[PDB]
Amino acid sequence: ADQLTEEQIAEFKEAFSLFDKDGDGTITTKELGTVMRSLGQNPTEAELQDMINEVDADGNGTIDFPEFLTMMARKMKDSEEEIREAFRVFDKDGNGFISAAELRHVMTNLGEKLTDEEVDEMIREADIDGDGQVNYEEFVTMMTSK
Ligand SMILES: [Ca+2]
Ligand SMILES: [Ca+2]
Ligand SMILES: [Ca+2]
Ligand SMILES: [Ca+2]
Numbered sequence: 001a002d003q004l005t006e007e008q009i010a011e012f013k014e015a016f017s018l019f020d021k022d023g024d025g026t027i028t029t030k031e032l033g034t035v036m037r038s039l040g041q042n043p044t045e046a047e048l049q050d051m052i053n054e055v056d057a058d059g060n061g062t063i064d065f066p067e068f069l070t071m072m073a074r075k076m077k078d079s080e081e082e083i084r085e086a087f088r089v090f091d092k093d094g095n096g097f098i099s100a101a102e103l104r105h106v107m108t109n110l111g112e113k114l115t116d117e118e119v120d121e122m123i124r125e126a127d128i129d130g131d132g133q134v135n136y137e138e139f140v141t142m143m144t145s146k
Pocket of ligand 1: 019
């Protein structure tokens, strides 16, 4: 159930507005296809009717904000949870920080051999305050939800 602040809904409503081109508050297959053709996609009509249908709670044939949002919050919510759970696997001593030895050790046990250099590269494309570690905040920014 969408608890959400005023900011992520400002994001979700923007997300919606870009789909609802003529602004009548609902997204049609024709409006969905346009967006998707725009982003380089190649869908069929049967495909679009299929997307509009799994989210069309009231079966009227178009997606409205309420319907759009229920679904976007469920997604966003499943994602935050799997990123939260992933953090738990790397941070094996619970300190709230994933260190190189942590990441290295885990990668090894995960079916992957990495060098000292490679690990530092990973724990450095995420590290925003040069301390040699990735905390949950830094981690969540790397794994932008999904
Ligand atoms: Ca519309
Ligand atoms: Ca609907
Ligand atoms: Ca740790
Ligand atoms: Ca850090």
